[PDB]
Amino acid sequence: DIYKDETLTIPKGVTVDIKARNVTVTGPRGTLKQNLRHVDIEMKKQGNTIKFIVWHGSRKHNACIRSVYSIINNMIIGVTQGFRYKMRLVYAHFPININLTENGTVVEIRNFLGERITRVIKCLPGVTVSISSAVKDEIILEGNSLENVSQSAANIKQICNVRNKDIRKFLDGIYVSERGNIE
């Protein structure tokens, strides 16, 4: 074909700007900046919407068109509604210690199966994690950038990752159950 267009309506967020080849997406919760070098695609603004166009190309570039459409929409969800995820811990005999430091950025984790290894989980830039108080053994992490938020908890899931034991009997550990917006 000669055209491949997909447009998403811009919400009431503060900025849907794409100037200078960068995604400076600012909303009501805050401002987010991201590099727009995923692929040379036509980001065109039309009033209250931003149109993504891939004109006169093949599928190898056209398949990446929907990714930026999702990535901007993912940034739009963080700019407008944000992201708030809750991770649930499981303790059977030795409770796993957890200490939020640097406004919840430096997560001092210990006593995973009673181990003396000091597990320091440094949060990604722009995300704040906290121990949820409603449900025990629950950690609530929220932020604007969902990609940095999701990768941090996955890193937290990879922090106290069980090894050198049978996964069946040894089953208590760190898990993620709630993954949703901040609004």
Partner: protein
């Protein structure tokens, strides 16, 4: 195509039915068959599909949408009797801790090993015993609540013209 043609041919004969001029959800398939059992039937197919085959019929084709069907058993039973059933996707409350499938009405089947894992809600199954609002009135029917109300005891669903042969007066009442 043939299946749609089979429903259009049957509806054509249902349009040529004797009387009772019937034009008639969240209930089960047994409820329709029981209604077919209480009828000397349960055959809807696709909405407006027969209208596409049929083509005051022009005004009736405009109103041809939704769940309708020709049958001959009636009018009082349709107006008064409405079958209670679980709805599709009141303020049902989630009982914390050890819960029962009857929402406390059991004078408590808490041994739901596979269903608790299939639920995904925040309920810890400590020592094999599950321990943690199911719904809210005035809000939309949540599918997760609909999955919860399927396990719960919430039957919150109560499941207009006479197209006569000589009259053919499809009233809008």
């Amino acid at each position: 195509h043939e299946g749609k043609a089979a429903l259009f041919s049957g509806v054509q004969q249902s349009l040529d039915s004797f009387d009772y001029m019937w034009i008639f959800t969240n209930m089960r398939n047994t409820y329709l068959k029981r209604i077919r059992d209480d009828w000397k039937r349960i055959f809807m197919g696709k909405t407006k599909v027969m209208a596409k085959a049929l083509g005051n019929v022009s005004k009736l084709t405009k109103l041809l949408h939704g769940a309708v069907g020709l049958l001959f058993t009636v009018i009082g039973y349709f107006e008064s009797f409405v079958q209670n059933d679980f709805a599709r996707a009141f303020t049902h409350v989630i009982p914390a801790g050890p819960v029962y499938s009857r929402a406390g009405q059991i004078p408590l089947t808490h041994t739901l090993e596979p269903q608790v894992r299939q639920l995904g809600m925040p309920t810890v199954l400590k020592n094999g015993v599950v321990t943690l609002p199911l719904c809210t009135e005035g809000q939309q029917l949540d599918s997760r609540q609909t999955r919860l109300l399927k396990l719960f005891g919430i039957t919150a669903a109560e499941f207009l013209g006479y197209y006569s042969k000589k009259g053919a007066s499809v009233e809008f009442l």
